[PDB]
Symmetry: C2
Subunit: 209 residues, 2 copies
């Protein structure tokens, strides 16, 4: 052995930005022994102990240790407000409890600029065309970009991960591919962007023929 290790993970960006999703912080304890398998978790939100976390059943691993996980749902507004979530792990194999703390990225937020680009000339002779959504100058990097048309999700797009720019902000592109048909008939397509620094955390940019 050697004592357990603790890793603390943030919620997913899309869960923090959507009212219908459940953002969670996850405190993962590994190298928990057969002899001392009991793990106690204490959770604090800016120092105030909360009691509504849920510990998953211990999971035996291939190397003969346990993985013990505790999951705390965070209020969407608390995460966005920069509250700090501390997981304290107690176990009889540890010399003292281990604490980890996480919170949203801390720099000044910066709102994305969003532009849509119509299909490149070479594609007007093909069966499918691509529309582009350029999203740049945002911070932090947490963001969600989708496409829709007639209020339905389009699913055929691919978005780069955010890329760190020299000025400390991020940029990305998303590319939607649609049947040329749909474009030539004047259907309106929109790039949706959800990011904390936008007004109302959301913006859309629309285009058509």
């Amino acid at each position: 052995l050697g004592g357990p290790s603790v890793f603390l993970f943030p919620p997913k960006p899309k869960d923090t930005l959507m009212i219908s999703r459940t953002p969670e912080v996850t405190c993962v304890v590994v190298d928990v022994s057969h002899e001392d398998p009991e793990v106690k978790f204490n959770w604090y939100v800016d120092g105030v102990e909360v009691h509504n976390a849920k510990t998953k059943p211990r999971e035996e691993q291939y190397n003969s240790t346990y993985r013990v996980v505790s999951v705390l749902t965070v209020l969407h507004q608390d995460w966005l407000n920069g509250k700090e979530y501390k997981c304290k792990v107690s176990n009889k194999a540890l010399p003292a409890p281990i604490e980890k703390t996480i919170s949203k990225a801390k720099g000044q937020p910066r709102e994305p600029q969003v532009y849509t680009l119509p299909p490149c000339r070479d594609e007007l002779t093909k069966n499918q065309v691509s529309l582009w959504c350029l999203v740049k100058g945002f911070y932090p990097s947490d963001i969600a970009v989708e496409w829709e048309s007639n209020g339905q999700p389009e699913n055929n797009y691919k978005t780069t991960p955010p890329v760190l720019d020299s000025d400390g902000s991020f940029f990305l592109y998303s590319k939607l591919t649609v049947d040329k048909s749909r474009w030539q008939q004047g259907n309106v397509f929109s790039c949706s962007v959800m990011h904390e620094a936008l007004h109302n955390h959301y913006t859309q940019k629309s285009l058509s023929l």
Copy 2:
């Protein structure tokens, strides 16, 4: 112990596409023991044994095994022609020699389309502007994208890794950032792209005010 393991690595895309660079295949042998440290390499180019590989001095590792590496330079035209490079590793701890073979990606090549985009409206009021180079529909993914102006490299750009598209081809974008000055005075900037499927393996797209 358990016997040595072999990993074979391709040359870098930029080395294969530039006449002044040295593309190499690298045969890496790990978990070589103190007792049987001697490693013999045989190399073959489409079955023909070649004798100009160079074995690096054995390198002792932190876990008390050796890492032994052999490096074979490949002719630029041979790699592009799809020749297969086989590394055969013999060592007294192995039941039989181990062989690995690698070659360029095998699908049909497909030439990139390249477009440059001038600065977004929001930036005309800033100190720096970004120019964009969109490169799409290429295959294989090996490619090199740079920027220049007045025949000198511009170094302030960032290029995404190739992204796999639904149609089996790749796309990427490169973004150069320059002082607004330079753009407003009419300097010409160009996106260079080197890819095997372009005519003469190279193309440039240029833009200015």
